[PDB]
Amino acid sequence: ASKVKQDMPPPGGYGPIDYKRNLPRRGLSGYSMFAVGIGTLLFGYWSMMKWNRERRRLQIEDFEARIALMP
């Protein structure tokens, strides 16, 4: 003869439940990304310039060794 016991919601109420779309912005601006890309390209160009000039000098040296040995 005890009290009625049934599955029921708790005293007061259940906590609020989220349902709305949540997609944060989470990114840099286009200007920053373009600037970083162009800077990387320029740095690579200058490094390649130095290395290619050094390689040209090395090729000239090897060709001169061949010229010395040819006769």
CB of 57 to another protein, least distance (A): 54
Q: What is the rounded CA–CA span in Å between residue 23 and residue 39?
A: 31
Task: Scan for tokens 């919601």, then name that residue.
Answer: 9
Nearer to another protein, 7 or 61 (CB): 7
Task: Scan for tokens 């000239």, then name that residue.
Answer: 60
Q: Which of residues 13-42 bind another protein (CB under 8 A)?
A: 14-15, 17
5 binds another protein (CB under 8 A): yes
- For another protein, the binding residues (CB under 8 A) are 5-9, 14-15, 17
